[PDB]
Symmetry: C3
Subunit: 304 residues, 3 copies
């Protein structure tokens, strides 16, 4: 069979049935990485890596995905004049798949249209990051075992957080989900997501009491609250500070089967001695990105 998506660009390309299929493939890719013999699935295929905004973690995730499958890479750490449409039409002559990260929203769409070859969005500015939401939902399926009938908290900057929005969207494709929105009032989630969730059958609750929510949740997804979002209201920052941190006291209330997650990078919103608890899943999360992006590379080049 051949893959049903010609590119990987945005979250709305995915439906529940697809996501389950992709995660099955990702567990095949995990069995490959752990093997001791070098796979040749993608032998002969080249990947161009175009990172107009550089993220070392995310690139090497992708490059490592290509080489763990037997492919090779035409790596470009910056790439930051000429049109993007010209850059893509030229690069596709030297490669078979393109993984781009831009500083401008809309860049992935332009490229996928221009390109005759698969294009994967590794970060379209302030816009969508689909591989990040895919690894986040696969990480939940993997840590908790189920995606139906789960409770997830989304903590931090929800108004302007691009990772929590893209994730909520994808979680909505499953049954019996409840989502908590733990944040200060000034960075609470925006109404297009809330309405999307009510429409999709998702029960949701707003709160400022992280301590109360973590005790009831199957998952705690942490994101930093930047000071910039508080602007002039520094009294609201003062109050907010220290109330939305994952620390040893927060793990006390959490259920033994719950987990802490994080898109990374993280500062002091998660403390170091959380890393000891097996429930801290943000590093297996990052590893899980290797497996998911292996599946996409595989499916986009040689189908199911």
């Amino acid at each position: 069979h051949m893959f049903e998506l010609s590119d990987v660009i945005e979250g709305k390309q995915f439906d529940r049935e697809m996501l389950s299929a992709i995660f099955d493939v990702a567990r095949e890719m995990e069995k490959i990485e752990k093997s001791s013999s070098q796979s040749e699935i993608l032998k002969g295929y080249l990947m161009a890596t175009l990172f107009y905004e550089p993220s070392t973690r995310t690139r090497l995730s992708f490059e490592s995905a290509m080489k763990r499958l037997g492919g090779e890479v035409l790596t470009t750490e910056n790439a930051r004049g000429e049109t993007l449409e010209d850059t893509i039409r030229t690069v596709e002559g030297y490669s078979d798949i393109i993984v781009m990260r831009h500083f401008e929203s809309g860049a992935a769409r332009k490229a996928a249209a221009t390109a005759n070859i698969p294009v994967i969005n590794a970060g379209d500015g302030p816009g969508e990051h689909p591989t990040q939401a895919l690894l986040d939902v696969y990480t939940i399926q993997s840590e908790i075992g189920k995606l139906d009938g789960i409770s997830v908290a989304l903590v931090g900057d929800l108004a302007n957080g691009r990772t929590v929005r893209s994730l909520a969207y994808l979680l909505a494709k499953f049954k019996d989900v409840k989502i908590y929105f733990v944040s200060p009032e000034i960075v609470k989630m925006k109404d297009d997501i809330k309405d999307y969730l009510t429409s999709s059958g998702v029960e949701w609750e707003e709160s400022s009491d992280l301590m109360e929510v973590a005790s009831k949740c199957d998952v705690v997804y942490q994101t930093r609250i930047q000071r910039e979002r508080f602007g002039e209201r520094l009294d609201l920052y003062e109050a907010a500070r220290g109330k939305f941190i994952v620390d040893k006291d927060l793990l006390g209330v959490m259920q033994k089967k719950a987990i802490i997650m994080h898109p990374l990078p993280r500062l002091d919103e998660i403390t170091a001695d959380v890393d000891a608890d097996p429930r801290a899943a943000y590093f297996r999360q990052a590893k899980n990105g290797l497996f998911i992006r292996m599946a996409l590379l595989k499916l986009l080049l040689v189908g199911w």
Copy 2:
């Protein structure tokens, strides 16, 4: 492309790719012959291993994502591997850098911002060196893939008319191309430019010494109709200097657009070395005579053929 009476090695020597004069017709025939075989190899679906075991070192002091990936791809399409360095700018001098890097690799592809560095590396190294662009100096792989594209699209190089448009005084690309088209028979060259940036007398001389016919014109529209090839390059506004009156007059008169394509022959082609801003309109892209992206992909086949000739021979 003709009929081979001898299947053994060629009589030329080729240990570095540094400057146009290197290339006689025999080397153009050899390089173009091999390039057409690499085209087969790239389109082929089984990974080649001609340059298995070889390591290319990629030193781009003047970063160019387009040129570098072309060379890196070419190497990896022939089964070689690449130690890449996108931005090699930082000073320890170049010869210390080359003599060290040559220990770590089998071939070096340098692109400098300063002229004469390609020649310094070629002499300092005891491995092959390819000039990916010597700053304001030679860019030979570009000139090679320009000529190879004309033959590829138009079928021939003898008896063609070629328009060179844009900054001809300071155009690094167009001068190299004119020098390499001069080596053929019955070629006519049109220098389409404003007076401020017309071609320098040292090129106009060489084309007269070597019998090539050339004509000047600031009326691109008239020339476009009489040509096999329109080779567009941008005119930077900085070249006019204080004469902003002359910039106003030139503005809009050297631009490839759908209007220009109308008056153009059906078998002629549009070429651009890239990058291109607004001197070629985006709606020209759809027309099959817009060969600037096929021109770029040609860079891959020509750069694979060079790697091959340099590391394994015939």
Copy 3:
């Protein structure tokens, strides 16, 4: 036989026997690089380069090493960008099988080695330990001279603050009947810790400012630069030093036939260009030897002896 070391962080890890044993591995890696059939020893292994402080020379050394052995590389020339290195290393180790890192800040190689459950090689700890430089230096001496016991080595240049002369001196002392001339302006003479170490190590050392007299007594002349920065305000001591610590045609004229000139590079006018033509100029051979030492370390840490 697995490799006795789990990371290559500092010099104090090495003893006389480990060094000689590792050097033999390098002479094997020399035969592999000269071979025409591509090696596959490290096939299926991925190296992650992490150069916060860019060094095109040092990086390619390591990358070429991995690929000559059949491994592959996840390159990053400039890793400087605000998360913690510990967080960064843990993530990377998910994507790789060995991490080679160069940092600008002292103490980072220690951090990375402790965090990762895969091997780490220190390519430069900022101003701290640069162990694979000290290793390729000693191996180049053994290679050109033929032995490390009973040699005379002159360390020339900024001795007070130069980490390379100190790290080379550290490893050379592990051998028998060595002598070291500290050639340098008086204000940048070698610090007491190293002198006490050499004395306690059974090593003879002699301070001098006369590079011409020392040169004729030496098997090796290890040249480094003396940045004007090091004199601080004593530009009189910089003018007095100028011209007197240079390796030039005149100096080559007083040195033994089987002596050599070494330099870790980058080198400016402290070695003149007509010195490269002489066969005793070993600094470019020295750099090539880094390929072999670095192949040997990659190979040992990942599959062992």
